Amino acid sequence: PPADQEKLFIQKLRQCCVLFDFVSDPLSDLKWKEVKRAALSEMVEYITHNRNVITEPIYPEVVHMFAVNMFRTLPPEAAWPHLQLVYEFFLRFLESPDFQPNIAKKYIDQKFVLQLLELFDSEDPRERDFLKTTLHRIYGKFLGLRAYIRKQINNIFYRFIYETEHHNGIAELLEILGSIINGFALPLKEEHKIFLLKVLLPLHKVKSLSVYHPQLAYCVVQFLEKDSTLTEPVVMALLKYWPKTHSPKEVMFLNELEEILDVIEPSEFVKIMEPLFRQLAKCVSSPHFQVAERALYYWNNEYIMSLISDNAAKILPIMFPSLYRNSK
Amino acid sequence: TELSTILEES
């Protein structure tokens, strides 16, 4: 009945929107940073454990407090203790069982998720981890934003492939998409298939592939476990984007290629087995021992030897030409 | 943080 408990919550949220920086007096600055850090810690534990505290007027105050503190200009950081508490408070706000997306959708709009994506270019890996979790939760709770979030993530990827070729959050964004792909509907819609062929595959061309390669490979494998039909244009694309210059970079392609073979269908294997083992034979005879060791590890794979024993008439003449011939 | 699966459609 009395809004004293709700009014104090709104007071402390609005108090955290004061970007004061006292300067001049160092003691007053430390006192201000303390009371803001204390208020944030108080609200974090309050919203996590107390029940029925997220009332309807609380929603616009939380989103405003997050926007005033987080949506800033990225430096080219000593204020991280405050930033981390705001990420934690917002995450506990989204994860609360009392959180109602029907109310927060009025304030978690497209303009909000756009400014949230701009923060993924932060150089701080701790910040990108909080952004990764935050956007993953917004996607899963706001169906009216899922189409927009997928569209804007692609715009960041198209710019990263054909323009700037510089973005520090490529790995975190790909980690989010891996959970969306794992839940894709039965007949993969055309939007998702165009995303695989024209976004995920061209991501192997960028020079900085070594930074987001584990995440990129996971999205490619999950696409083939949903629809095995896409195995042929994926494998042929990796062979196209394969580093013709023998370098340690092609060890990453060998890992992605075995992870694909672990989920490939037999009927889909025979359609690309010849061009694949022709590249694989080039790796087992490569001057770089590190890439030959990784290729020779394919024989240790139990499932891969089964596909070779079933296609020995065509695969063996390619791997060991001095010992096996072929004909009609 | 491994991120749980997000179902496209129920």
UniProtKB/Swiss-Prot annotation, chain A:
Main location as per UniProt: nucleus
GO cellular component labels: chromosome, centromeric region; cytosol; Golgi apparatus; nucleoplasm; nucleus; protein phosphatase type 2A complex
Entry superkingdom: Eukaryota
One MF annotation (Gene Ontology) recorded for this entry: protein phosphatase regulator activity
Family indicated by similarity: Belongs to the phosphatase 2A regulatory subunit B56 family.
Subunit note: PP2A consists of a common heterodimeric core enzyme, composed of PPP2CA a 36 kDa catalytic subunit (subunit C) and PPP2R1A a 65 kDa constant regulatory subunit (PR65 or subunit A), that associates with a variety of regulatory subunits. Proteins that associate with the core dimer include three families of regulatory subunits B (the R2/B/PR55/B55, R3/B''/PR72/PR130/PR59 and R5/B'/B56 families), the 48 kDa variable regulatory subunit, viral proteins, and cell signaling molecules. Interacts with PPP2CA and PPP2R1A; the interaction is direct. Interacts with SGO1; the interaction is direct.
Annotated protein name in UniProt: Serine/threonine-protein phosphatase 2A 56 kDa regulatory subunit gamma isoform
Residues of the full protein shown: 34 to 379 of 524
